[PDB]
Amino acid sequence: TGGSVHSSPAIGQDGTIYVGSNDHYLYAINPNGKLKWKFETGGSVHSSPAIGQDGTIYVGSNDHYLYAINPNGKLKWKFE
Amino acid sequence: TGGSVHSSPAIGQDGTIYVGSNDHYLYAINPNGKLKWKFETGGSVHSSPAIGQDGTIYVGSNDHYLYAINPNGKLKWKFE
Amino acid sequence: TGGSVHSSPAIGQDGTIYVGSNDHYLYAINPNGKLKWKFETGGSVHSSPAIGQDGTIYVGSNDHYLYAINPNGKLKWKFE
Amino acid sequence: TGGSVHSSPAIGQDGTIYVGSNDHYLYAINPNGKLKWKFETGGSVHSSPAIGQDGTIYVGSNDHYLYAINPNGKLKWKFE
Ligand SMILES: [Cu+2]
Numbered sequence: 001t002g003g004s005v006h007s008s009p010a011i012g013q014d015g016t017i018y019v020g021s022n023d024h025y026l027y028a029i030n031p032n033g034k035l036k037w038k039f040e041t042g043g044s045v046h047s048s049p050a051i052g053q054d055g056t057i058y059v060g061s062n063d064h065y066l067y068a069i070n071p072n073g074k075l076k077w078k079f080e
Numbered sequence: 081t082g083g084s085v086h087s088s089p090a091i092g093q094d095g096t097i098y099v100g101s102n103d104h105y106l107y108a109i110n111p112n113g114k115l116k117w118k119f120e121t122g123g124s125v126h127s128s129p130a131i132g133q134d135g136t137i138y139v140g141s142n143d144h145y146l147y148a149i150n151p152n153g154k155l156k157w158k159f160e
Numbered sequence: 161t162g163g164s165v166h167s168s169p170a171i172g173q174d175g176t177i178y179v180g181s182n183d184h185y186l187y188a189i190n191p192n193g194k195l196k197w198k199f200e201t202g203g204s205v206h207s208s209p210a211i212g213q214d215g216t217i218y219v220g221s222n223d224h225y226l227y228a229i230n231p232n233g234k235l236k237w238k239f240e
Numbered sequence: 241t242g243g244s245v246h247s248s249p250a251i252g253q254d255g256t257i258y259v260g261s262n263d264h265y266l267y268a269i270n271p272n273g274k275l276k277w278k279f280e281t282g283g284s285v286h287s288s289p290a291i292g293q294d295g296t297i298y299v300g301s302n303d304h305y306l307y308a309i310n311p312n313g314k315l316k317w318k319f320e
């Protein structure tokens with residue numbers, strides 16, 4: 001990514017790999033190694049993502065928020 | 081939250097999202113993004129919560145304790 | 161414990177909670193909050209434990225080793 | 241390993257234990273404590289590995305990449 005990957009990856013049901021980066025983004029990578037999407041938070045994503053029953057991806061950020069991202073990379077909500 | 085979310089979220093059986101914050105609290109957030117409760121420890125919650133078979137939430141804190149929280153946010157025990 | 165709990169807990173099949181501490185120990189805590197045992201490594205246990213199919217607990221340490229502990233707290237092996 | 245093990249281990253279906261090290265390698269250790277292989281990245285492996293449905297091991301590195309390693313230790317891809 002653009003910075004250290006301290007975050008630990010999570011794997012979705014279709015094999016998508018989600019991981020944060022110190023570059024501030026949450027990455028969704030296809031199992032073939034090509035980017036599916038990236039979502040920008042306001043600070044390093046050290047937190048490791050979790051996947052809910054409906055596929056929502058949750059991850060914290062050093063920007064103080066817990067993010068809930070939809071599987072298509074669009075923000076569901078953020079909690080401060 | 082009030083500080084960086086380094087902690088990695090855990091998801092309960094009803095979809096509740098639990099995560100620590102450097103603001104010293106463990107947060108329980110409803111799947112709609114509204115706060116269910118927060119529990120205050122005495123230091124940053126870098127540790128990532130785990131959920132036991134009965135729903136108890138366990139998480140460490142920089143205050144030296146491992147906390148066991150009930151699903152309703154009331155302390156079960158803390159271990160130093 | 162004796163220092164910050166940065167490690168993230170793991171839960172065994174009988175509900176035992178395993179977590180590292182910056183005090184250098186891996187802790188096994190009974191679901192009632194009483195200590196089952198502690199195992200001493202040579203440096204902070206920031207790593208979060210994993211539990212194998214036979215119940216062995218694996219965790220890293222800042223002492224450079226990956227530890228394999230038996231469920232009774234006796235060392236199985238360490239790898240440097 | 242050659243440096244602190246901050247990474248948290250993952251366990252494969254055959255019991256292999258995967259963990260990163262600040263020495264820059266991802267380690268695959270057999271359940272008997274003998275090395276199965278190690279894979280070198282370009283910086284500390286603080287990230288904790290995840291295992292996909294086909295056994296691929298994914299882990300981040302402070303070198304900015306998310307790595308996808310095959311179960312035999314050969315690189316599948318890396319994503320920057
Ligand atoms: Cu860098």
Ligand SMILES: [Cu+2]
Nearest residue numbers: 022024043044
């Ligand atoms: Cu930044």
Ligand SMILES: [Cu+2]
Nearest residue numbers: 062064083084
């Ligand atoms: Cu801040």
Ligand SMILES: [Cu+2]
Nearest residue numbers: 102104123124
């Ligand atoms: Cu503080």
Ligand SMILES: [Cu+2]
Nearest residue numbers: 142144163164
């Ligand atoms: Cu202290």
Ligand SMILES: [Cu+2]
Nearest residue numbers: 182184203204
């Ligand atoms: Cu020390």
Ligand SMILES: [Cu+2]
Nearest residue numbers: 222224243244
């Ligand atoms: Cu060292």
Ligand SMILES: [Cu+2]
Nearest residue numbers: 262264283284
């Ligand atoms: Cu280095």
